[PDB]
A paper describes a structure:
Unlike vesicle coat proteins such as clathrin, COPI, and COPII that cycle on and off membranes and share evolutionary origins and structural features, caveolins are unrelated in sequence to other vesicle coat proteins and remain integrated in membranes throughout their life cycle. Using a combination of computational and structural approaches, we now show that caveolins across evolution share the ability to assemble into amphipathic disk–shaped multimers composed of spiraling α-helices and a central protruding parallel β-barrel. Each complex forms a disk with 11 spiraling α-helices and a central β-barrel, with each protomer forming contacts with two protomers to the left and two to the right.
The [name] [name] complex, ∼127 Å in diameter and ∼46 Å in height, is a disk composed of spiraling α-helices with a central β-barrel. The variable N-terminal region forms a short α-helix that is positioned about halfway up the β-barrel before snaking along the cytoplasmic-facing surface of the complex. Each protomer makes a 180° turn at the hook structure, which is followed by the spoke region. The α-1 helix forms the rim at the edge of the disk that is ∼16 Å in height. Finally, [name] [name] has a C-terminal β-strand that forms a parallel β-barrel with a diameter of ∼30 Å and contributes to the ∼46 Å overall height of the complex. As a result, in the [name] complex, additional contacts are made with the i + 5 and i − 5 protomers as the variable N-terminal region of i rises up the central β-barrel and contacts the C-terminal β strands of i + 5 and i − 5. The three β-barrels have a similar outer diameter of ∼28–30 Å; however, the [name] [name] complex’s central β-barrel is ∼10 Å longer than the other [name] complexes.
Author numbering:
A (entry chain Q), B (entry chain R), C (entry chain P), D (entry chain H), E (entry chain O), F (entry chain L), ...: 79 to 231
Write the structure that this text describes.
């Protein structure tokens, strides 16, 4: 069962999956809060132990949901208002103060850089043109043996 | 028997299997608690030793299951309640206090970074544009011999 | 649902995606300010919790939009004028003072560099022509085994 | 004989075989306790020496099995009970104390990490964006000679 | 919309794009001075905010263009004349003083270099002919498994 | 003769042959104790020397086999008994004392590791996400020439 | 428009373009002295600004060409004569003094080098023949998965 | 003649030939004791020198064979007996004392190693899981030109 | 025009072009002494400037050729004689003194080297046979995705 | 002529040619003692110089052959006898003293090594199993352009 | 003309050309002693200068050949005799004194090396078997895009 579904999921897409191109992400997607994950089992229960598991499951989940509901209703109500106020101010500041500052800084930088680039390169490039000659004159001799078998499915 | 099933399992999927992309995982899946694994044997028993193995197996497993059942029933019932309370509070705090803090921090960071990026790069890039010339001017001469045999199955 | 659309998006283009060739960019595209992202949830709500989520959503979004509207109307109006003045001056200076300076600097640099290049290379090149002989005389012997299976879909 | 079966076993599967992905394994599978392995021979015996080998084999194996049977019957009986007790307690503790602790630790960690990630990257990334320019501007010239022979079996 | 056009643009040409072969270039092509870029928005406006955006846009752009026009007309007029004078002198000097100096320097250098090259190489080459023997005698054994699936579109 | 059989043996299997995956092996398979190997010859004997070789062979082999037979019969008999006793005890201890200890140690370790993993990674990972940007922006230009000849056997 | 012609120019030739094989070259080909390049613009002008651009263009270009013409006629005339004299002398010296000196130096060097080469190699080569054994005994096990899609245009 | 047979011998098998997998081998196969090898010639003799070579050959070979025959007959006779005695004792000791010691050592080692492995890895692995992120995010752009010619023989 | 001929010249031969295999070469082939190269122009002349260029060209070239002719006739005549004398002596010495010395040195070296080679290798090789085991036991798992488009011209 | 035969010889076999697998070889094959090689010429003689070459050739070769013949006849005669005596003794010692010593040493070594191997590996291996995790999690994105031309001869 | 013949010569053979396998070679093949090479010209002569070149050529070549002829006739005739004497002695010594010494040294070395090899390896190999585990567990994810164009000529 499990391994078959796992292999089916692995065979759909074989390419890269990294997420390093985004620096402003949360970690919430990895967490798992559920009875089968919070209270792991080392080997398969028998029917004599399944009843105990069954009782404990409802106790745990009922308590966990009750507390969350109560706190969300009677304290989240204030948190939403309070966070909304500061988030509105933050949006205003981002639009009307940071962007213009960054654009003006870009203009001030882009007018000086070319001369420094040219000046440094004109003086330093020969040292690496000379060093380039070390990777000329590569020469390889190769010999091979091989066997192959193949099938059509 | 065993090696054949092992090879059959190996030939289904030949790709990568690492799990480094998840930093919040448990190690429970690797453990094996069973008589044939807890009391290993160096070579195949004969029928004169199988009887002793048979007696010891039931003794071990019966004791192991009895203790676990008793403790699960008379002490797990309290652990479930106690853990549920704190887990409810933890969920509330994660939703209503951490997320807003992180989003506000993201807004405060994203408004300063571009200028530092531009300023550093404008001053440091030429040093690596000059160093790039070392990998130009590669030149290779190659010669080959080969034999091959193949079959259709 | 979600994983299928993700895989569909991944399979359209498999090439490089980096943006290092631009040094004057903002980070705004990565941010996400919305209730479902500002107040994350660790596991799927049930219908008893969806109502609380529903109330909190409207409270948060209403406050956030109201503050932004008011500040944009009664303070952004002055910011636009003030930034426009300095941006006009910045454009004039970029066109009529920086460009000529950079072009004259280019002319002054390009008239001296060739002699320094020739002088340095004539004295330093032999040291890397001699070092080039180390990568001659490579010789490889190789042997291979292989099995393959394939399908047409 | 032997080399042929060895080659037949090698040609079934040519892929990786390492076991580094499991950190909780025993070494029992490598051991070999048998007369032909415990008392190795440097060269093939003749029929005059096979008789001596034959006598020594039965002596060794009989003694070895007798001692193991006696100790397994009259001492393994107590070991099974004693180990079963502690293993039951160990299972209970693993399920009802370690898992909840680890999950709560995960929740406490996952709420702080994003801000540290963003803060560090925003300050350190440009230093490696600048260094990336060294691997641009690679250029290769290549020339080849080749001979090949092939067969269908 | 946007991602589709982006992918269409990416699929036209998949080759190298670097510009390191030119050391005398400006950075003007990367800049973007426009209201939608100078005053970025974190999420899509609604129609109640579009009106405020609409007013601010015309204010900003009108002021920015007016100042630039006035300064270009009443100060760029003098800048053009003044820069033209010095640029004419610069062209004359580049043609009639730098080029001859560089050519004469080339002649003076090219008459001495060959002897230094020969003298250094004759003394230093053996040290790298001896070191070349380290990359002889490479020998590789390789085994492979593979599965493949393919389609015609 | 000899080289042909050597090449025939080499062409059967061309894959890897190392044995590093087993840490508990003996070296007996490499030894060769025989007259033609114990008393090597630098060049092919003639018939006048073959007679001397023939006499020496029987002397050497007869003495060597006699001593081994006598010692195996009158001293190996005791060695077999003595080693069998200790090997029986060793098997008992391996089964009934080492395995349980190792399994209990596994349980004690596997309950602590996840938290340390998460804690270390959450603090250290950004330092290597930043360093990952150095291998972006690789760009290659390549040109080729080639000649080929081939045959069917 | 522009990007299409750029891509058309890029697709003609995809090979190496470096110029490191020539050490006696000028940098004139990279420079661009023209009004559209000397006085860059950050964004497209409108028709109200095109008139100002039009006036400034003729002023700049007229002044620049006038000064260059006058100086070329009344001072380049003497520069040509003066440079011609020294260039004639330089050609004579290159032909009749440098070449013979270099050829005689070649003869004096080529008569001593072989002995030094042989003497050094005979003493140093074994040290790198011994070190060559480290790259024998490479062994690889590989496994693969793959999907492919293709089209004819 | 010679080069043709050399090339014929080289073309039979093109794979690896190293012998590093055996640590208990002699060097006798490389030696060559014969007149044409003991008394080398720098260039082809003429018929006037072949006669002198012919006389010297028989003198050398006759003396060399006579001494070897005499010493083999009158001293090798004792060497065979003496070596046979010690070799018989050596075989007995190898079978009946070393093998059991090594097997018992294997059992004593294999019972302790797993715990040390698990303990070290649980503490040290995260440091290399974090370091693994440096080889993500590789991105390559490549362009190619090629010409090819081929023949059937 | 120009770029088309450049590309036509680049597409004829795509292989290596280095000249490091010759240590006794001159640099004359790189130089360019002509009016269009000695007096470079930054941008295309108009017909009003072409006349000035036309006058200066003839002045420069006439003077340059006159001086060279006169010096070649009235001073090269003596240089040829003087250099011929010393070159004749140099050829005689190269043939009749250097070659014999080098051949005798070769004979003296080639008689000592083999013993030093054997002696050093016999003592040092094991250290690199042991180090060879580090590159055994390589194992790779790979997975791929791909899209392709192609045309016949 | 010459280059054609050289290329014909190069195209027969394109594989490896090194000789590092033999440590007991002489260098005689590289030497060339002949008038055309002992007295080299820098450029082709004319018929007026061929006569002088012709006289000198016979003088040199006649003297060289005469001295060698006389010394070979009247001194090589004794050298052959003297070397034959010691070579006979050397062969006897190699067969009847070195081989047995080496075989006995092999037996003494092969009985101790396995325990040291196991003991070291059991303690040191985890340190390199942990370090193996650094080469997991490699991820590559690649894009390509290509042109090709081909011919049948 | 010239470039076409150069390219024709380059396209005949594309393989390795190094000569490092021979340590006893002269450098005469690289030299070029001729008027067109001894007295190089920077640019093509006109017919007014060709006459001066024509006179100088005959003067130089006549003097150079006369001196060489005279010295070859009246001094080479002694050199040939004198060198022949010593070369005869050198050949005799090479055949009858160096070869036997080297062969005896080979026999003395080849009898000691195996024991040192075995002894060192048995103690040092485990250290590199343990280090081999670092290159296991490599895992790669790859994705590709490609375009191709091709022609038949």
């Amino acid at each position: 069962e499990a391994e078959e579904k796992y292999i089916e999921r692995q065979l759909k897409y074989l390419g890269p999956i990294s997420q390093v191109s985004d620096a402003y992400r949360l970690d919430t997607t990895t967490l798992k809060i559920e009875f089968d994950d919070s209270f792991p089992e080392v080997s398969k229960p028998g029917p004599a132990l399944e009843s105990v598991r069954k009782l404990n499951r409802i106790l745990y989940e009922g308590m966990s949901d009750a507390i969350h509901i109560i706190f969300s209703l009677f304290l989240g109500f204030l948190a939403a208002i309070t966070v909304g106020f500061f988030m509105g101010m933050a949006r205003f500041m981002y639009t009307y103060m940071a962007g213009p500052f960054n654009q003006l800084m870009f203009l001030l930088i882009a007018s000086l850089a070319p001369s420094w680039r040219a000046f440094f390169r004109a003086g330093m490039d020969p040292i690496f043109e000379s060093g380039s000659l070390a990777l000329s004159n590569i020469q390889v001799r190769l010999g091979m043996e091989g066997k192959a078998r193949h099938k059509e499915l």
